Amino acid sequence: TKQHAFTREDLLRCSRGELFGPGNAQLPAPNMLMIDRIVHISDVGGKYGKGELVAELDINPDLWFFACNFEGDPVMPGCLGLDAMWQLVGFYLGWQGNPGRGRALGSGEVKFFGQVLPTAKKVTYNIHIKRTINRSLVLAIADGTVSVDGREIYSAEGLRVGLFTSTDSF
Amino acid sequence: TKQHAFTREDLLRCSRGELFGPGNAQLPAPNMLMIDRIVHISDVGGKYGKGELVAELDINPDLWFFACNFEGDPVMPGCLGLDAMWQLVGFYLGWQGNPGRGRALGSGEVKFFGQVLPTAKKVTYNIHIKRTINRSLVLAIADGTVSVDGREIYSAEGLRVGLFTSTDSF
Numbered sequence: 001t002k003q004h005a006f007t008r009e010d011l012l013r014c015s016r017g018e019l020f021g022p023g024n025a026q027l028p029a030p031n032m033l034m035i036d037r038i039v040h041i042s043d044v045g046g047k048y049g050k051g052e053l054v055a056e057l058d059i060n061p062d063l064w065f066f067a068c069n070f071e072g073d074p075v076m077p078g079c080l081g082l083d084a085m086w087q088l089v090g091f092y093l094g095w096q097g098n099p100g101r102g103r104a105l106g107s108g109e110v111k112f113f114g115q116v117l118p119t120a121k122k123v124t125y126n127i128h129i130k131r132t133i134n135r136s137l138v139l140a141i142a143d144g145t146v147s148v149d150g151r152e153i154y155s156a157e158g159l160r161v162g163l164f165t166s167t168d169s170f
Numbered sequence: 171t172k173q174h175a176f177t178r179e180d181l182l183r184c185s186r187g188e189l190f191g192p193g194n195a196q197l198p199a200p201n202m203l204m205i206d207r208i209v210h211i212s213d214v215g216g217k218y219g220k221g222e223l224v225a226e227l228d229i230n231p232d233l234w235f236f237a238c239n240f241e242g243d244p245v246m247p248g249c250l251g252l253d254a255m256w257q258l259v260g261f262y263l264g265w266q267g268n269p270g271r272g273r274a275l276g277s278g279e280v281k282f283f284g285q286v287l288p289t290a291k292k293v294t295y296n297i298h299i300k301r302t303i304n305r306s307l308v309l310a311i312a313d314g315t316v317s318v319d320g321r322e323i324y325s326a327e328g329l330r331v332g333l334f335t336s337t338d339s340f
């Protein structure tokens with residue numbers, strides 16, 4: 001819980017298993033990695049007073065998903081903005097000092113009410129930690145929002161991610 | 171509303187705007203496309219009696235997302251399986267004859283309670299259309315499940331996808 005911001009290089013180190021070590025939380029590597037940086041992470045404050053993260057993804061027209069999603073109608077997939085939020089909540093669990101590899105477990109309501117176009121400059125994620133367990137199973141529940149250049153465009157309530165020292169139950 | 175099965179080639183045609191026509195519903199192209207084939211699509215039956223789709227994705231170890239998600243611990247992104255269910259619900263709106271381009275609007279509860287490993291053979295999607303509106307807003311509400319080689323692994327309730335003849339709304 002020592003560092004309160006991470007650079008892209010740190011996130012890529014995490015993707016290689018080199019931030020949290022053997023058997024522990026990894027972020028997806030490119031091209032599934034949906035975060036460039038965590039500008040702030042803490043175990044206090046946020047909407048429930050149980051911690052929060054603020055992170056960013058830089059947008060430019062050349063990001064791979066614009067060319068296929070859709071042809072002649074480029075828009076960032078909503079599911080990748082949602083994955084950034086599961087990615088962040090997983091990271092938080094590792095950052096707190098819990099062992100195990102991440103698996104998203106789901107969410108309550110997800111809403112997409114705006115879009116990221118290839119003319120956008122920056123997407124900002126806000127994550128509010130609602131509750132963590134680490135007696136027994138390791139589990140985080142969180143709410144999140146996605147904003148593009150100042151404008152709220154997605155929300156997710158009850159994001160759930162687990163860390164697992166064995167993933168043969170799945 | 172007359173063809174009931176669609177091959178990968180038909181789905182790739184759809185990604186180019188050539189199944190439902192220009193300005194109308196498109197699937198994503200690879201690598202965001204998460205369906206190889208629609209085995210069945212109907213506007214009757216299913217859990218609500220208001221329509222259903224059954225669709226498949228073939229799994230092999232060389233699919234692109236396995237290398238990066240995660241490194242040394244391959245597993246299909248839940249977010250892409252979810253997107254497959256949004257992709258299918260959008261397809262159903264296009265298949266019904268409605269004009270306009272697709273956008274996922276969200277879902278109620280998403281649960282991931284098992285995983286697709288690179289040794290799996292085939293992912294099956296089941297979509298049960300719950301409600302469609304085709305006056306004013308064009309909107310579909312659906313439930314879905316994802317299975318892998320017979321085993322149920324994901325669920326989503328209240329998948330929502332809209333068709334938009336203008337997307338500057340978003």
Ligand SMILES: CCCCCCC[C@@H](O)CC(=O)SCCNC(C)=O
Nearest residue numbers: 026027090091102103104247248285
């Ligand atoms: C640094 C820590 C990151 C852990 C969270 C990564 C974001 C998830 O969306 C990726 C999966 O969980 S893909 C597998 C989805 N779940 C199952 C049960 O297969």
Ligand SMILES: CCCCCCC[C@@H](O)CC(=O)SCCNC(C)=O
Nearest residue numbers: 078115196197257260261272273274
């Ligand atoms: C024929 C299939 C097209 C309908 C839905 C395709 C699958 C969706 O996941 C893609 C988006 O909607 S990406 C944009 C998410 N929504 C907004 C408002 O940004």
